[PDB]
Design a protein around this motif. Structure first.
Motif, PDB file in Angstrom:
ATOM      1  N   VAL A   1       0.904  -1.292   0.053  1.00  0.00           N
ATOM      2  CA  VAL A   1      -0.124  -0.021   0.169  1.00  0.00           C
ATOM      3  C   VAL A   1       0.968   1.087  -0.080  1.00  0.00           C
ATOM      4  N   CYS A   2       0.217   2.502  -0.503  1.00  0.00           N
ATOM      5  CA  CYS A   2       0.841   3.624  -0.104  1.00  0.00           C
ATOM      6  C   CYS A   2      -0.077   4.288   0.678  1.00  0.00           C
ATOM      7  N   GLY A   3       0.471   5.466   1.350  1.00  0.00           N
ATOM      8  CA  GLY A   3      -0.334   6.382   2.149  1.00  0.00           C
ATOM      9  C   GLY A   3       0.160   7.359   3.042  1.00  0.00           C
ATOM     10  N   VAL A   4      -0.534   7.990   3.908  1.00  0.00           N
ATOM     11  CA  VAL A   4      -0.168   9.128   4.749  1.00  0.00           C
ATOM     12  C   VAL A   4      -0.181   8.686   6.317  1.00  0.00           C
ATOM     13  N   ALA A   5       0.595   8.851   6.943  1.00  0.00           N
ATOM     14  CA  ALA A   5       0.613   8.671   8.573  1.00  0.00           C
ATOM     15  C   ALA A   5       1.153   9.921   9.046  1.00  0.00           C
ATOM     16  N   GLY A   6       0.338  10.681   9.739  1.00  0.00           N
ATOM     17  CA  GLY A   6       0.854  12.196  10.314  1.00  0.00           C
ATOM     18  C   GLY A   6       1.099  13.063   9.201  1.00  0.00           C
ATOM     19  N   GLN A   7       2.490  13.452   9.067  1.00  0.00           N
ATOM     20  CA  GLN A   7       2.958  14.112   7.832  1.00  0.00           C
ATOM     21  C   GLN A   7       3.921  13.410   7.115  1.00  0.00           C
ATOM     22  N   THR A   8       3.854  12.098   7.160  1.00  0.00           N
ATOM     23  CA  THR A   8       4.833  11.319   6.527  1.00  0.00           C
ATOM     24  C   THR A   8       4.082  10.246   5.137  1.00  0.00           C
ATOM     25  N   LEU A   9       4.637  10.551   4.123  1.00  0.00           N
ATOM     26  CA  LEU A   9       4.160   9.790   2.954  1.00  0.00           C
ATOM     27  C   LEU A   9       4.914   8.429   3.322  1.00  0.00           C
ATOM     28  N   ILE A  10       4.067   7.285   3.079  1.00  0.00           N
ATOM     29  CA  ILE A  10       4.654   5.950   3.021  1.00  0.00           C
ATOM     30  C   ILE A  10       4.456   5.147   1.918  1.00  0.00           C
ATOM     31  N   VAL A  11       5.218   4.587   1.246  1.00  0.00           N
ATOM     32  CA  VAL A  11       5.211   3.599  -0.114  1.00  0.00           C
ATOM     33  C   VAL A  11       5.948   2.299   0.108  1.00  0.00           C
ATOM     34  N   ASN A  12       5.173   1.525  -0.042  1.00  0.00           N
ATOM     35  CA  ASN A  12       5.273  -0.052  -0.156  1.00  0.00           C
ATOM     36  C   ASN A  12       6.112  -0.568  -1.563  1.00  0.00           C
ATOM     37  N   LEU A  13       7.087  -0.904  -1.673  1.00  0.00           N
ATOM     38  CA  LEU A  13       7.653  -1.310  -2.855  1.00  0.00           C
ATOM     39  C   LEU A  13       7.764  -2.894  -2.811  1.00  0.00           C
ATOM     40  N   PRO A  14       7.927  -3.639  -4.063  1.00  0.00           N
ATOM     41  CA  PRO A  14       8.128  -5.116  -3.897  1.00  0.00           C
ATOM     42  C   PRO A  14       9.642  -5.270  -3.362  1.00  0.00           C
ATOM     43  N   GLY A  15      10.159  -6.659  -3.161  1.00  0.00           N
ATOM     44  CA  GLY A  15      11.295  -6.686  -2.875  1.00  0.00           C
ATOM     45  C   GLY A  15      12.345  -7.238  -3.775  1.00  0.00           C
TER      46      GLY A  15
END
Lengths: 152, 157, 155
Positions: free
Chosen positions: C116-130
């Motif tokens: 997934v991708c999303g926002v937590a607090g003021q942080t952008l978080i991006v999941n990439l494959p391995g």
């Protein structure tokens, strides 16, 4: 050999003698790919779908394919029934199955079908039409072997 | 069929600017067998959810919102919409986002949803005129079918 | 005027034993340097709670961008999506979708990634494959949107 279960989700289908093409299309696809044992259930929309899913999951069936009941009208509760049994969803696979119906069938975007894993079982919601079923099987064909292996 | 347009923009509701999206949506509806109610321009947040609830309770057939679907601190249209929905229709929201590609890459940041509440279809659109047009073009091919289904009229296989 | 910080989390239990050949971390680090992220930090954690622990830490610290690599599949050890969704305020489904699509048609199994991708607090978080290939595919998707996304998050 890996086992599979087909679930036709349709009160209409379950209300008479089943003579439709979708069950066989899926069974033939599975049979020709060496799935065994292989069985077929036709059940009414609503709780009988969840019941059948639960039965196959507890029996540790490798792959469940459902057909029908994924739209947005009041009797379409396959996605609800499926999500209730799932451990997690695989959104990319459901999206790929929807996209395979475009641009030929614009209302493909209305299907709310999900795919996911429950226990050690891969579950795939397909649409109720033969065209949608074939489109979805063609998507599944290039990933199902790898998916089952990864679940294991 | 009835329709309600809701513009979600505090800056438009003030209004520091004149909304361009509402009239685009209204003409589109009128071409296509809809009779639009008076559009609402409301501030982001709870007023959006309140206008959605009012329309659902009045059994408006179709609600289209525009704006507040991004990821800024005041973009709460998706939260407000989900709170009113019975279920979402992910493929429709997806197709509406993809319609912005490849010309507008940040289209992928839109978190607009589509779904059903009661017997009402709700569609979140972006806040840009271009995004609204792209989204309406997507909606055009499916919207009457969807509404027929939500009314309980269908032919299960 | 202030630069955006970025944290790289490699989700691989193996990289704690002599797996020692994490190729993806360096690729992401270089890509982030090239796009003006600073300072940069990278770390490897085992699958599961350490991933969420690492996510939570960087979110609390107001890190601007977190990119994770690995653990997004459907195996019993792939828990990165669960760990991520637990920290998120909301998801950005279009971004995860675009990243998956970038692997098509040459890598059909791209559709199995649950990142997934999303926002937590003021942080952008991006999941990439391995895989290095999936990472490069994902980074290409981010290339024309990531600073726009951080602009929007900040207002």
């Amino acid at each position: 050999a890996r086992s599979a279960q087909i679930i036709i989700a349709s009160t209409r289908a379950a209300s008479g003698v089943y003579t439709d093409e979708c069950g066989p299309i899926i069974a033939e696809w599975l049979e020709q790919r060496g799935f065994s044992p292989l069985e077929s259930k036709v059940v009414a929309d609503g709780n009988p779908v969840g019941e059948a899913l639960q039965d196959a999951v507890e029996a540790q069936v490798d792959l469940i394919i459902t057909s029908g009941g994924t739209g947005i009208s009041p009797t379409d509760s396959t996605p609800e029934q499926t999500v209730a049994v799932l451990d997690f969803v695989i959104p990319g696979l459901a999206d790929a199955i929807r996209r395979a119906g475009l641009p030929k069938v614009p209302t493909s975007v209305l299907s709310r079908g999900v795919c996911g894993v429950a226990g050690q079982t891969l579950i795939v919601n397909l649409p109720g039409s033969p065209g949608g079923v074939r489109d979805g099987l063609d998507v599944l064909a290039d990933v199902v072997h790898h998916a089952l292996d990864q679940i294991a």
